[PDB]
């Protein structure tokens, strides 16, 4: 339900481990902005 | 109570996960500096 | 399983440690990439 | 009594939270640099 | 034993806390690198 890594690229990617996936997107713009709904998975389990 | 996250973007802004909000902004200067009062808060739950 | 450190350096690699050893290689962009498959074995333990 | 967390800025500058309190400096530059007696406290609360 | 930070500066040199200590040094290349061993001591306690 939260996030166990979360942290920047040195592009300013945030990439974050959610429910052992592992997801990066641009930076939620305000806090309406369902970052999990619309960061791309790059990675399915194992994280 | 405290932070669960703390960290920077590559930008310099700070970011901060606190009860499950996100929290950035400039870091503080001072401890005079209520950070967490004047941070931009971009994430309303799930962090 | 997963990771106890997973973070990236400056010059875009990511890092991290899994069961005590220590990984690096570009970052995943699929979910199709099994990363922790054919990432670089930097650190054979005590990480 | 240690750190809880332990970062950099982009710019090369340490941050770290001792006892809830937030610090900044320049990185140690041996052992005999005693860090959190010469470190600026930023933050003397909430961290 | 392990590490209770591991992190990189922005310079590219990798930094780690280990039983207390601060360690630094160029990232390991191939897991026969003994990197602690080889790593510069810049802290002897409280970390
Ligand atoms: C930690 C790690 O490398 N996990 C990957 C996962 O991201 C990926 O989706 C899967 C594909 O089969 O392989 C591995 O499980
Ligand atoms: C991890 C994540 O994406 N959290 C966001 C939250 O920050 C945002 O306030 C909310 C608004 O709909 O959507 C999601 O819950
Ligand atoms: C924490 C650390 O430096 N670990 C290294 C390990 O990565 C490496 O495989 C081995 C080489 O003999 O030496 C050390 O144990
Ligand atoms: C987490 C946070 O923002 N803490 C700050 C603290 O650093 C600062 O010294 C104080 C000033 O009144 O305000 C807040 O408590
Ligand atoms: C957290 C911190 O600043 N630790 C330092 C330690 O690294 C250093 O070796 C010593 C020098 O006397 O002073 C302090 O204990």
New binding site residues.
Partial sequence: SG?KFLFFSPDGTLY?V?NDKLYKGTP?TS???????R?TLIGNGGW
């Fill in positions: 996030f974050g959610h939620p806090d309406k902005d369902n970052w999990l709904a960061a």
